[PDB]
Design a protein around this ligand. Structure first.
Ligand SMILES: CC(C)(COP(=O)(O)OP(=O)(O)OC[C@H]1O[C@@H](n2cnc3c(N)ncnc32)[C@H](O)[C@@H]1OP(=O)(O)O)[C@@H](O)C(=O)NCCC(=O)NCCS/C(O)=C/c1cc(O)cc(O)c1
Ligand SMILES: CC(C)(COP(=O)(O)OP(=O)(O)OC[C@H]1O[C@@H](n2cnc3c(N)ncnc32)[C@H](O)[C@@H]1OP(=O)(O)O)[C@@H](O)C(=O)NCCC(=O)NCCS/C(O)=C/c1cc(O)cc(O)c1
Ligand SMILES: CC(C)(COP(=O)(O)OP(=O)(O)OC[C@H]1O[C@@H](n2cnc3c(N)ncnc32)[C@H](O)[C@@H]1OP(=O)(O)O)[C@@H](O)C(=O)NCCC(=O)NCCS/C(O)=C/c1cc(O)cc(O)c1
Lengths: 414, 416, 416
């Protein structure tokens, strides 16, 4: 129309040509490495410039002018087929996934560029965020048996309904509840079921008993992202890092968006419920990120909280968005930039934790706290609080930049 | 189109059913579900009509945003100009004579309306400006206040001294519990304090109580009148919204005047610093007020709480403002779980600047009134309030609040 | 075209007639002083009204529809020539600068009105802010020699590259690093060089050894604005108060905006780096304001922090924007409105300072902290943090109002 799509198509062609004619990654010469790096850079710069003016038109083709809610996975897949060279195809990602991270060309970065541009749009952004708040198909599929049975066993999460509480137990006993793509799917499924189940009034997140010998018999909340999978190239930008932030973690804040199915939808299109978190052992990385979103947080006297995501190379999700509000900008930089670790019994733990109780009194204090969040008044108040604490624009703008900043960190030399 | 026609139909089915059905509380199970269903269909259409037509509606009522109408006048004019969108004065009269439990909930329609108005980037700021303008009552009382320095109201006693507007909340029988009259007296007093050129600083304090448990003792505020709430005397528009957009917002941003003085081009609103002194306790609406003052003092024996949650409603704009003072953990402890903060515990310093023994309190109040005098304080507190609470932030909150609070006003746990 | 430019031209003409025919400032009568004050007020009111509707058109003429980046000094100069009477000429400002503050007509206020209107625009505002993030010509000029030698000596700042650290030493040993127009130019130049030098990974700001007899041999961070120059009329609204906020202080937050010169510009158009501050003695006023944008802050056990500006009659830069986020609204008003002074060893110092060290361990603790901020991961995380903490709209809206509020404080009576 005015040159950008054609110039991008060309820049992507030069990339495919070099990737076809050059040696494999570990065999390229210094001159060859600079040649491909420059080609990638020229294509990505044009991906940004194309979308600065054409993002809404692209999103409209993919969503039929914002009448079809597409989740992240479906969105980036449809974008690849409808706009070749804008974002990688399923195949090109398949090739990337079989390689070690160091040998990857970095095609996920193109998805970072795309999702940044979509979320920056005041029209496309809120619509994509709504799509991710809708219930997952898996959860709709499991909902009737959960209502009948009160119990669902998944690979990384055990869900149980007892006394109007949805009890989510993170139960990866071999690896201290380290996070991967499967844990995100199980968590979102369980969060969806907790919110849609009419016999659930409050949610509870806790780590289960561990089996690994260093922690046998001990509960552990979360050791954060699976560093092995990160190194091997098993951590997906879209299906893990973005999915968790826009899916289950955002649903803890704002609920699940339903269809116009029920009375009161005109005032409450989303079903939200209060959430309690109980921390045993420690909350590290992604686990600690979760605590910034709960209505009540309890911890054992011996627990600690840290975000070592820094020195590790990557951004701790939306902790950079939320932590300042809890601890102020000095402490939030101490934790995020310099890896400060906060112990449950030091005074500043009160910035993250409501109750710190000795292991022998912890179970009973958890139970008491589940009784204190029951009514419709709690729902209205937590909704107004979350609206004040984190505006839709605030969250949307952060996740937009995050999509690309985190994509780049995923492929940095660190 | 038809958007307005379908609403007109849905409201007609409501009026039909209300005319032919039994009085509330002797309707059968089938009858109660039918009217509930009719209300729901009408309210759903009120929302969608206004999602696309709010600006056009507001423009008809305000002559394209060239007439400032306050809340009461706005919803009245909306009812006559758009029958079935919001209740008439009469229908509200009928609602008010009933107990909360027997009400049909017509105030919810006003919640729907004010939500849509405040959501508009054009209508919203204009309505908020209208509510920052001086009340007619205050313009009426201003000359005598300037001459006399003294105005005795129902729940408030204004008094000018050494350049201080001394507001004393003086409902000695009921611990300064809030009602529609107290809001009118407070806004009137705040308007006079800001318009009186001999006033440099404002002071809010509770007066000596007469009720026997507190005779001789000052008490700041026991919050909303729970008796009146149960009886249906708490108005969504004239109490809950009026206080947030009127006097409480004026404490933050001042009164908007006409272009009738020098410097209006840079300061269209007259704002002044405010000091609050808490005796006994600040509960509910009283505690909400502390989040808006430039200095807060409290007696050693005072406490602060927002039981508005336990009651069944939202504590005004505390959900907007408290997180900024105490962070999201403490603010949920106070609002969701009813935590009560004592003047002498460390975290009181998140809400209170000075905690003084009763015998040194009067003198510490006086000293604090001398420290906020200049034009430099005005400029700095204006920049601080602009940073702390953006116009969009407040507008977006009050928009959702208008409807969320309307629904809580008619929820079943409140009808206790 | 709508009457506003002509009415402004008239109002400015009546000002000029009166200034030509009236006595000099200290010889005017009561009636004469009221008349010129009224003429100024009418002209300034029209400057505001003209720009409320015409600001974008004005900015577009000056910047060729936002395709030429002009810094503040160049912008207001071009505006004076292209729109006579909107803002003062270089000629008129020269006359103002030759007078004491009390005798000035206040023409800088017109620049406050102009910059407020520009920054309020969602189109012009971000574009002006980008222009001020671009490298200064002086820094581009000094960059090659800095890369070669690793060392630059300026009047108020000594810059040294060492172990990948840009070491900025504020070195006004005679006056405790009091700020003036030259210090702003040196600071922005040094910050530009630190960001553009590829051998610089982290920045460090510290005060040098003092020579004044009360502090001989002792380091001092900053005593804030030069109060002597303020009284004499040597503090420029544009070249000092606005320049520092939109130039080097904003560059500490967001980096320098470069040309499309380098790989990765499509994702990082600005070069940002982490900054460490080390406070010896005290940080007062503008010095304390700087601590609010650093990534790590260290302080001597004996240091204190204060913003006595308010007591002086002026606003402490963007402290009113940033401080609440560090200390909450109670403490931020205690510091800004009531002049509270925070000592490095009291508990609430931890709201501003990461480490408080005894003088004998301070040098080594500074060195340790410089090694801890090296990677690309730190860069991405501090970028996301700063985006969350302070939005572009938030900063832009604040600086817009600040431009005029601070201009008025510059000419208020308690400042003179
Ligand atoms: C220090 C300690 C807490 C305890 O140390 P013992 O000596 O008590 O424990 P053993 O080490 O014996 O524990 C038994 C087994 O569990 C494994 N394992 C542990 N954590 C992880 C992990 N994050 N990813 C993968 N595996 C993990 C451990 O490697 C070992 O493997 P073996 O059985 O093959 O030997 C430990 O967990 C520790 O050092 N943890 C490191 C945690 C860490 O740095 N996490 C990264 C934070 S960063 C993070 O989460 C980024 C993030 C960003 C986002 O945008 C979203 C998100 O969701 C996450
Ligand atoms: C705990 C204590 C404060 C003290 O307990 P003693 O034992 O010291 O005190 P006695 O109970 O003897 O009190 C002496 C006299 O004062 C009367 N009275 C007090 N408050 C109210 C009221 N709100 N409405 C009406 N009357 C009231 C009390 O009835 C009695 O009069 P008699 O003798 O004529 O019966 C107690 O009063 C107490 O629990 N009060 C309820 C406090 C409370 O939770 N209020 C509502 C919070 S909720 C709130 O404010 C929501 C709110 C939301 C908004 O969006 C805006 C807004 O503006 C408000
Ligand atoms: C408190 C103390 C530090 C006490 O220290 P001793 O009493 O032991 O030390 P001596 O005071 O003798 O120190 C030796 C010499 O240093 C000179 N000097 C010092 N400060 C300044 C200054 N701000 N401006 C100019 N000169 C200054 C002073 O003249 C003196 O005499 P010599 O002329 O013979 O050299 C004192 O200096 C003191 O009270 N300082 C005032 C601090 C103050 O109010 N600052 C302004 C706050 S307000 C402020 O910064 C507003 C502001 C707003 C903005 O938007 C941007 C911005 O950048 C600033």
């Amino acid at each position: 129309t005015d040159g950008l799509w054609a110039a991008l198509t060309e820049a992507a062609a030069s990339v495919e040509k070099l990737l076809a004619t050059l040696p494999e990654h570990g065999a390229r010469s210094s001159a060859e490495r600079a040649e491909i790096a420059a080609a990638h850079d020229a294509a990505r710069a044009l991906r940004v410039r194309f979308l600065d003016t054409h993002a809404d038109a692209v999103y409209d083709r993919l969503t039929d002018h914002r009448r079809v809610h597409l989740r992240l996975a479906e969105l980036v897949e449809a974008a690849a087929t409808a706009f070749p060279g804008l974002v990688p195809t399923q195949q090109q990602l398949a090739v990337e996934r079989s390689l070690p991270q160091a040998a990857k060309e970095g095609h996920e970065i193109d998805q970072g560029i795309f999702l940044r541009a979509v979320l920056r749009s005041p029209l496309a952004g809120p619509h994509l965020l709504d799509a991710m708040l809708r219930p997952t198909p898996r959860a709709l599929e499991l909902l009737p048996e959960f209502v009948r049975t009160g119990e669902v066993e998944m690979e990384a999460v055990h869900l149980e309904r007892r006394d109007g509480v949805a009890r989510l137990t993170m139960c990866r006993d071999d690896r201290l509840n380290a996070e991967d793509g499967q844990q995100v799917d199980d968590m979102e499924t369980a969060v969806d079921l907790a919110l849609l189940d009419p016999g659930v009034r409050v949610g509870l997140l806790r780590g289960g008993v561990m089996s690994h010998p260093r922690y046998r018999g001990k509960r552990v909340f979360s050791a954060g992202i699976n560093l092995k999978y990160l190194s091997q190239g098993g951590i997906s930008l879209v299906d893990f890092l973005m999915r968790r932030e826009l899916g289950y973690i955002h649903k803890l804040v704002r609920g699940v968006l339903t269809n116009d199915d029920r009375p009161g939808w005109w005032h409450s299109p989303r079903i939200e419920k209060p959430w309690v978190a109980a921390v045993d052992g420690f909350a590290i990385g992604g686990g600690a990120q979760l605590l910034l979103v709960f209505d009540r947080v309890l911890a054992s006297s011996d627990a600690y909280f840290s975000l070592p995501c820094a020195k590790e190379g990557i951004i701790p999700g939306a902790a950079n968005l939320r932590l300042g509000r809890f601890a102020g900008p000095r402490v939030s930089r101490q934790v995020i930039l310099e890896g400060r670790r906060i112990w449950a019994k030091e005074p500043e733990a009160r910035l993250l934790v409501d109750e710190v109780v000795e292991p022998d009194e912890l179970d009973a204090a958890i139970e008491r706290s589940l009784t204190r969040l029951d009514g419709d008044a709690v729902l209205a108040n937590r909704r107004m609080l979350n609206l004040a604490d984190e505006s839709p624009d605030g969250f949307r703008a952060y996740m937009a930049e995050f999509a690309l900043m985190q994509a780049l960190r995923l492929y940095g030399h660190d």
